[PDB]
């Protein structure tokens, strides 16, 4: 698939929706980003950074009216340059739940509450993207 890739989420997200992204991190990658969007707002930005001051960190945040909010940072970093990955995002009633390579990684409490209006997922960064799909569990 071509990156950046836009995956429509028809009628928005709902609890029990599972999104699966398969790809390979490029050698010498700098960043990956998943952006769940509500129009111009970003309800959930998930942003692995491979070199922030010589550390690897995952930054999560929300953008409202063009302004970024308070960051939530995770130091557990399961991505590896050059290697294949699987990201699964499970929508639960109170948070997005993220697993990488079948291991739980983090939860992100819903700040944007109109879940039915979060109707696009943007996938970008230094990856080769193999597939991006959703199903209901
Ligand atoms: C406060 O802004 C930083 O932190 C934000 C999260 O709190 C975003 O990750 C944002 O990134 C959004 C962003 C970065 C980007 C980088 C390359 C290409 C396209 C990009 O599109 C973006 O929205 C960051 O901004 C910078 C300089 O990386
Ligand atoms: Cl809202």
Swiss-Prot record:
Coiled-coil boundaries: none
Main localization, broad class: cytoplasm
GO biological process, one term: macrophage chemotaxis
Residues given in the record as a beta-D-galactoside binding sites: 68-74
GO cellular component assignments: cell surface; collagen-containing extracellular matrix; cytoplasm; cytosol; extracellular exosome; extracellular region; extracellular space; ficolin-1-rich granule membrane
Modification Phosphoserine, positions: 75
Keywords: Acetylation, Cytoplasm, Differentiation, Disulfide bond, IgE-binding protein, Immunity, Innate immunity, Lectin, mRNA processing, mRNA splicing, Nucleus, Phosphoprotein, Repeat, Secreted, Spliceosome
Tissue-wise expression: A major expression is found in the colonic epithelium. It is also abundant in the activated macrophages. Expressed in fetal membranes.
Domain called Galectin: residue spans: 5-135
A molecular function (GO) term: RNA binding
Subcellular location: Cytoplasm; Nucleus; Secreted
Motif (Nuclear export signal): 113-128
Signal peptide segment: none
Superkingdom as given in the UniProt entry: Eukaryota
Function: Galactose-specific lectin which binds IgE. May mediate with the alpha-3, beta-1 integrin the stimulation by CSPG4 of endothelial cells migration. Together with DMBT1, required for terminal differentiation of columnar epithelial cells during early embryogenesis. In the nucleus: acts as a pre-mRNA splicing factor. Involved in acute inflammatory responses including neutrophil activation and adhesion, chemoattraction of monocytes macrophages, opsonization of apoptotic neutrophils, and activation of mast cells.
Subunit structure: Probably forms homo- or heterodimers. Interacts with DMBT1. Interacts with CD6 and ALCAM. Forms a complex with the ITGA3, ITGB1 and CSPG4. Interacts with LGALS3BP, LYPD3, ZFTRAF1 and UACA. Interacts with TRIM16; this interaction mediates autophagy of damage endomembranes. Interacts with cargo receptor TMED10; the interaction mediates the translocation from the cytoplasm into the ERGIC (endoplasmic reticulum-Golgi intermediate compartment) and thereby secretion.
Protein name: Galectin-3
Source species of the chain: Homo sapiens
Taxonomic path: Eukaryota, Metazoa, Chordata, Craniata, Vertebrata
Segment of the intact protein contained: 114 to 250 of 250
